[PDB]
Amino acid sequence: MVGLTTLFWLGAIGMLVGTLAFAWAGRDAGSGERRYYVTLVGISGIAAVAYVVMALGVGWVPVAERTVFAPRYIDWILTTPLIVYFLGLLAGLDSREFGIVITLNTVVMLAGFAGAMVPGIERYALFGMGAVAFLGLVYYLVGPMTESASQRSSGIKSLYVRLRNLTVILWAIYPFIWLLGPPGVALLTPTVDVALIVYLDLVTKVGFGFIALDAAATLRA
Amino acid sequence: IATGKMGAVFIFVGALTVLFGAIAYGEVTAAAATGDAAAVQEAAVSAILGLIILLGINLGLVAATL
Numbered sequence: 001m002v003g004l005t006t007l008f009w010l011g012a013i014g015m016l017v018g019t020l021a022f023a024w025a026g027r028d029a030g031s032g033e034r035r036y037y038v039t040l041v042g043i044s045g046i047a048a049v050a051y052v053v054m055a056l057g058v059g060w061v062p063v064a065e066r067t068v069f070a071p072r073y074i075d076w077i078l079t080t081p082l083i084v085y086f087l088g089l090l091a092g093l094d095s096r097e098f099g100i101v102i103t104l105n106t107v108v109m110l111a112g113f114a115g116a117m118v119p120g121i122e123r124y125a126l127f128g129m130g131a132v133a134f135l136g137l138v139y140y141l142v143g144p145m146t147e148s149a150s151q152r153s154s155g156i157k158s159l160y161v162r163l164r165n166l167t168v169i170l171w172a173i174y175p176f177i178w179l180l181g182p183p184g185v186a187l188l189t190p191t192v193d194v195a196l197i198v199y200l201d202l203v204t205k206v207g208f209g210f211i212a213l214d215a216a217a218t219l220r221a
Numbered sequence: 222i223a224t225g226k227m228g229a230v231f232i233f234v235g236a237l238t239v240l241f242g243a244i245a246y247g248e249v250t251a252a253a254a255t256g257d258a259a260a261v262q263e264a265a266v267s268a269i270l271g272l273i274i275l276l277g278i279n280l281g282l283v284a285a286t287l
């Protein structure tokens with residue numbers, strides 16, 4: 001009475017509802033305002049695609065005693081750079097340090113995927129790398145990008161601190177799911193792990209975009 | 222417009238907390254049906270860790286939204 005099928009299906013339909021909402025909110029386009037909405041729809045659409053392909057049965061990989069949901073790692077590697085792109089859009093980021101942002105993000109994500117695919121205690125060193133790299137990204141989110149967003153309008157600064165807060169808080173939970181779950185000390189049953197990551201993805205993407213929509217509407221009604 | 226605290230975020234975290242509680246209690250009953258106590262024990266520690274993680278998620282959400 002849980003169904004690992006049904007958690008993936010619920011995540012998929014939630015991401016699709018978010019996709020539809022973010023796309024319909026992009027009807028009245030703008031100068032650059034359109035690209036925020038296309039970023040939101042791309043994020044939630046790739047998320048929905050990954051969740052639908054996982055809901056069938058693909059990607060359930062046997063890596064020594066455990067199951068590796070590789071399609072959700074594909075999802076992460078493809079959709080987290082879109083989120084940091086949105087945050088750079090808000091804060092008014094450069095281009096090279098923007099590349100530093102996205103490269104560090106991809107370092108974390110690649111380390112996580114590889115570590116999920118390694119069967120020995122070797123993988124933890126891999127995980128360690130991501131941790132290190134993560135602590136870089138966080139700083140860039142709270143230091144350089146925040147200082148960049150400081151030289152901006154009131155509403156955009158408020159929206160940036162809201163989104164960067166949610167990101168910095170909830171992204172730091174994924175490593176504990178990786179460690180306390182199948183990829184490490186399998187203390188969380190696959191159902192609990194899957195449900196936790198589904199909820200995390202659902203909020204950190206769709207609720208992220210909902211907050212962004214609301215902020216934009218309020219600031220320039 | 223919702224409640225001062227947005228009559229959506231608290232009701233939302235509450236409904237999804239009780240949904241996760243249903244998930245965990247279902248796992249607990251399923252593992253107990255086997256009669257093996259070491260199966261429930263596992264399901265219970267995983268439910269406890271997951272509810273602590275859910276505490277973290279809900280608190281992050283309420284800290285960012287307010």
Ligand SMILES: *C/C=C(C)/C=C/C=C(C)/C=C/C1=C(C)CCCC1(C)C
Pocket residue numbers: 075076079080108109111112113127130131134171172174175178200201204205
């Ligand atoms: C919608 C997808 C999201 C929000 C993905 C976020 C993922 C992370 C923040 C993952 C972090 C990890 C590390 C810090 C180290 C390696 C293990 C990971 C991939 C779980």
